[PDB]
C-alpha cells in the first residue's frame, strides 16, 4: 500500500512544472487583454457616437 | 499568489503517520538476516552438548531419553542402595 501510495510522484511532475508555469504566466500576461478591451471599449464608443 | 504544490512538497509529507513510523522497523528486520537456515550449528559433542544432539533435539524430543536417564539412574541407585543396604 505504501508503494502504490508513493508511485505516483514520477511523470506526474513535469505535468506541475509545465500547468504551473504556464497558468502563472497566463494570469500575468492579462495586460494584453486588458489593452485589447480598453480598445475595443473605445472602438465601440466612435462606432456609438457614429451611429447616435 | 502561487498555487499550492502537493506533489513538490513531499519532502516533510511521508505516507500518513503510522506507515512512515514502521517503515525504519522493516526495512532494517530484512537486512541483516540470514537467507535460508544458513549455520545449523547442529554439530555439538560435550557431553552436555553430546546429549544435545544426539538425544536432547528438538525434533523428536519424546520420552526415550527420559527413559534412558531413568534406566541409568537406576542401575547407579542399584549399587548405591548395594552399598548402603
Redo the contacts between chains.
Sequence with gaps: ??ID??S??QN??ET?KVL?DV??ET?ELESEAFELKQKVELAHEAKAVLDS | ???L?P??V?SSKN?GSA?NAK?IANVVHFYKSLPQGPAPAIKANTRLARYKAKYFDGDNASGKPLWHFALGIIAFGYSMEYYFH
Design positions: 500500500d505504501r501510495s508513493v505516483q510522484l506526474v511532475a506541475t504551473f497558468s502563472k494570469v | 499568489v502561487s498555487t504544490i506533489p513538490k513531499v505516507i506507515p517503515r
